[PDB]
């Protein structure tokens, strides 16, 4: 049965959140596949169902808990459980539709949302963009409560979507990028919430293209440079994998690696 990582916003310190992110990366990647020192997530093709997900049990100071399911192939939050109900984002394809049946299997009340969980959708539903949604231990504490009270009608759909946007970035994006992990640690250290600045938003937006560029690179070198933003929104060209080693922690599997040469 699928591995669970626990995290609580109640204790929270930079140490406990680091321990949390590090254990999520640890269950996401196997160590089989590392390219230019960056781990690659498992290939979805031929990945057996018993290896497909991880679970992240989130608790909060209000004594509630909720369990998110992450897909190990892309680190995406696919769904969540709170007590007796589970909800899943609308699947992209038939294979994902079947795969999600293997989650939360004894829950009474299982629902699939009619909408997908990509940021663009969540952001319409929330009536707010990532750039205007504050992140930190307080947002997370409140996201946990919001997800936990959805089934009883207590949480409005825009707050639901906002709450996922919070969880996705604080968990899946932080697992993807050391840089994003460190942004969160800052928020937790000073106990202040704040919205992600362009340096975070551009990394999130670029994860898939960065993954492809790295895996397609010639000995590290990008065929086409990729534009990121710094905190003040200015351009930063990435020409090479080397500059990303302290920034990106995990990549999505695009292709088998070429023979080392
Ligand atoms: N539930 C969920 N979990 C995630 O971990 C996640 N990560 C990135 C994006 C996103 O829209 N990223 C940009 C993108 C662009 N095209 N597809 N995705 N959405 C997500 N949603």
Curated annotation (Swiss-Prot):
Catalytic activity: Endohydrolysis of the N-glycosidic bond at one specific adenosine on the 28S rRNA
Annotated binding of AMP, by residue: 76-77, 117-119
Effect of residue 71 to A/E/N: Suppresses the toxic activity
Consequence when changing residue 72 to A/M: No effect on the toxic activity or the vascular leak syndrome
Record note on biotechnological use: A deglycosylated form may be linked to monoclonal antibodies to produce immunotoxins exploited in cancer treatment. However, a point mutation should be introduced to eliminate vascular leak syndrome, a side effect resulting from endothelial damage.
UniProt-annotated binding residues for a carbohydrate: 4-6, 11, 46, 137-142, 191-193
Residues listed as glycosylation sites in the UniProt record: 6, 232
Active site: 76, 119, 173, 176
Primary role: Acts as a glycosidase that removes a specific adenine residue from an exposed loop of the 28S rRNA (A4324 in mammals), leading to rRNA breakage. As this loop is involved in elongation factor binding, modified ribosomes are catalytically inactive and unable to support protein synthesis. Can inactivate a few thousand ribosomes per minute, faster than the cell can make new ones. Therefore a single molecule can kill an animal cell.
Protein name (database record): Ricin A chain
Residues of the full protein shown: 40 to 300 of 576
């Amino acid at each position: 049965q699928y591995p669970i990582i626990n995290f609580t916003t109640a204790g929270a310190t930079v140490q406990s959140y680091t321990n949390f992110i590090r254990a999520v990366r640890g269950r996401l990647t196997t160590g089989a596949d590392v390219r230019h020192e960056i781990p690659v997530l498992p290939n979805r093709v031929g990945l057996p169902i018993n290896q497909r997900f991880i679970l992240v049990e989130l608790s909060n100071h209000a004594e509630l808990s909720v369990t998110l399911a992450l897909d190990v192939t892309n680190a995406y939050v696919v769904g969540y459980r709170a007590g007796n109900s589970a909800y899943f984002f609308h699947p992209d394809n038939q294979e994902d539709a079947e795969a999600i049946t293997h989650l939360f299997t004894d829950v009474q009340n299982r629902y699939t949302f009619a909408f997908g969980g990509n940021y663009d959708r969540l952001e319409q539903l929330a009536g707010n963009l990532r750039e205007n949604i504050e992140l930190g231990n307080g947002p997370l504490e409140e996201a946990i409560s919001a997800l936990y009270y959805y089934s009883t009608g207590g949480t409005q759909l825009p707050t639901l979507a906002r709450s996922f946007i919070i969880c996705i970035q604080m968990i899946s994006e932080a697992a993807r990028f050391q840089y994003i992990e460190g942004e969160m640690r800052t928020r937790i250290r000073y106990n202040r919430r704040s919205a992600p600045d362009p340096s975070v938003i551009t990394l999130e937006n670029s994860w898939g293209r960065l993954s492809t560029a790295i895996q397609e690179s010639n000995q590290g070198a990008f065929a086409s440079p990729i534009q990121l933003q710094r905190r003040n929104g200015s351009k930063f060209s990435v020409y090479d994998v080397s500059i990303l080693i302290p920034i990106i922690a995990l990549m999505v599997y695009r292709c088998a690696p070429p023979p080392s040469s």
